[PDB]
Amino acid sequence: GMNIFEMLRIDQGLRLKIYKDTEGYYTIGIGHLLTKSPSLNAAKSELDKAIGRNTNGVITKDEAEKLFNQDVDAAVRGILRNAKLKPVYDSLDAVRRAALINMVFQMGETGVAGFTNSLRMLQQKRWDEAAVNLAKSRWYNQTPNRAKRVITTFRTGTWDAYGSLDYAAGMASNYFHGYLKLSLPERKADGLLHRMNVYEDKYNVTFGIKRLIILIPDEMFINGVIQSRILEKATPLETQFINRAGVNRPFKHAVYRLAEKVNGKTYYFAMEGATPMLSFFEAMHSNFSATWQMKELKREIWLKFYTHLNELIKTWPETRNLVELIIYNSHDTKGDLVDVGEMLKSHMELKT
Amino acid sequence: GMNIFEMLRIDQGLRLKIYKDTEGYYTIGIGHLLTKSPSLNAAKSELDKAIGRNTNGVITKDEAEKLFNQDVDAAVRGILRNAKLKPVYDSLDAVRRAALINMVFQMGETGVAGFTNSLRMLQQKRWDEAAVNLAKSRWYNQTPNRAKRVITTFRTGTWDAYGSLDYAAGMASNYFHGYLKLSLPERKADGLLHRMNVYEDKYNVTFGIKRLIILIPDEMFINGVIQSRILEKATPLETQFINRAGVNRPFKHAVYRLAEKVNGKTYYFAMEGATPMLSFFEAMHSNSATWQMKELKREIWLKFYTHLNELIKTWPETRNLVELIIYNSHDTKGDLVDVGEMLKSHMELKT
Ligand SMILES: Nc1nc2c(ncn2[C@@H]2O[C@@H]3COP(=O)(O)O[C@@H]4[C@H](O)[C@@H](COP(=O)(O)O[C@H]3[C@H]2O)O[C@H]4n2cnc3c(N)ncnc32)c(=O)[nH]1
């Protein structure tokens, strides 16, 4: 997944070979200082003594990880001893503490202690106020890319600002950029709401909610189709064509309708299963044999996919009010398969 | 992102709460025996001694990974002290060493030493012979799934048996299972080759390559289109409809043709860019282009091509249906590369 190592590999960068930092000092891995000597062989001697073998200037990714956590433990020790930094650290969460270790590695302890007013707002949990003040910082001007991510990590307490670099978040990002953000927002005279308005006027029907509903069950659909006792498949929305990767690509959204009246109305729904999860389920079934180890990993990817997808949809105004994510267990507590048509009927009743 | 910890998390399993093994002994993490005492609080105190805090039976993934690396360090010390295992371990690279340590975690140090013939070919770096020899063992019979992944690690020296849940290899897996293998092979009387044969007969044209060409540039298409001075867009292939997660999904392929004849013939090509890389590039540009991210871009870009190419060749339904073209968007001079000249050169070679 995502942790402090992957975060600082983004902001600082990883080097499996010896390099020089901004002050010309020999360094390796993620900002692990070897020596202040201009001698390259003296830097190799310290590198060999730190790992236990004559690496001759090249180390493994695992060895670079075992150097980095030592520097994290050593940086925490100094943070706890520094009187200007320990009260902010003690009241911060681990994700925000990891963000607090981030600027420590970049500018040092004295530089982080310079932001006396921003640390005091983080200590008081005023996440929005210290986000605005770090934007005005000189550290923001020198590194505009890195300042935003540490700010958002302090403001949200999540790994959102570091994009999609693991398997789960990347499935949501490709889902988002390649389909949701691409085809649903109104662009030119076309878009999701436009297609639904043309659909409602053509068939004289009413959509229960004017959003694309995405089903994210923990298990793929039985027989690969949406199984329901009161929901039937209807004519899809008119296909919209969008140039994508050299193809005038057709994008189609399926439409289903309740076979039973709710409040005297037949409700339609533009909806679909979360097909990335289906492609993930299919890929996993071909490589692994459904052990308890895989079920935990599948559910872990399953949850992270929804959380990152829901975060991407909310942060972008073009898609904030266009998608409805429904994540659920395919079986109820009694063990029976959940009827998505019943879920939609109940949702329509709970507001009308 | 795959390593020995994530490998044993696949094969053996990670439990963050104190549990009891097959012999009724309290265990934590990935098979870390805590104590043989029936006292649960004795297991909690022993776990507190190993972690360094009042866990009371529950630990985090980082603590369990740190505890697992200690168990690996102890297993390596035992392997180096074993005269039967030390020579092969010294000769093996880091990845193949993890496959050896995987077996020690499963059957113990004395069990791995019995593979005398098997350890010899590994020491002499005969990977294919060692992979065949290991498949004959009883260890392959009791636990076949775990053995095949360890044997492939000995055979290839990579993490290809386990790394399907990494970003690049995972996006290639979704790209392969959810699109390439889904819609290109021939189902009933439909598929890519059928659409291309219908296309050649309707328009009386000839495809230069009887495959779907997937362009993998290191940079997004300019204005989202394929730029070329000798390629031009033609009528696309007829759209194929496949039911997919409740949607009658359309699968359409664009067709391009060479603007100039190659020995009197105009050659057509079904081709498109790699949509997982386009989304990845779009996401990288939103979250700027420092050297840290430029190396990470090329890293995922390279790993996506290699794992997608492996999946295409592994399955016979797709082995001769896809043509992957990975290339730098600019030459050394800095000029933009015309993808059509690459295809014209491909055509001029055997025609
Ligand atoms: N109802 C509806 N949903 C659509 C349509 N097009 C896409 N979706 C969704 O967007 C996701 C991203 O697809 P992508 O084109 O950006 O790359 C995909 C994906 O990486 C991989 C597996 O697809 P899937 O798991 O179903 O995720 C896709 C889907 O959920 O293969 C790529 N892929 C799938 N189809 C194509 C295609 N025609 N051309 C190129 N790449 C494809 C839609 O039209 N309707």
Percent of residues in helices of chain A: 40-55%
Q: Give the beta-strand count of chain A.
A: 11
What portion of the residues of chain A fall into strands of 2 or more residues? Answer: 5-15%
Q: How would you name the oligomeric state of the polypeptide chains in this document?
A: homodimer
Give the overall shape of chain A, derived from the CA principal axes. Answer: elongated
The main β sheet of chain A shows up as: 6 strands, mixed
Bound molecules: 3'2'-cGAMP
What is the H-and-E element order of chain A?
A: HEEEHHHHHHHHHHHEEEEEEEHHEH
The largest inter-chain interface, given as chain pair and residues per side, is:
A-B, 69 and 64 residues
What's the total helix number of chain A?
15
PDB class: immune system
Keywords: sting, cyclic dinucleotide receptor, immune system
Assembly: dimeric
Entry title: Structure of drosophila STING in complex with 3'2'-cGAMP
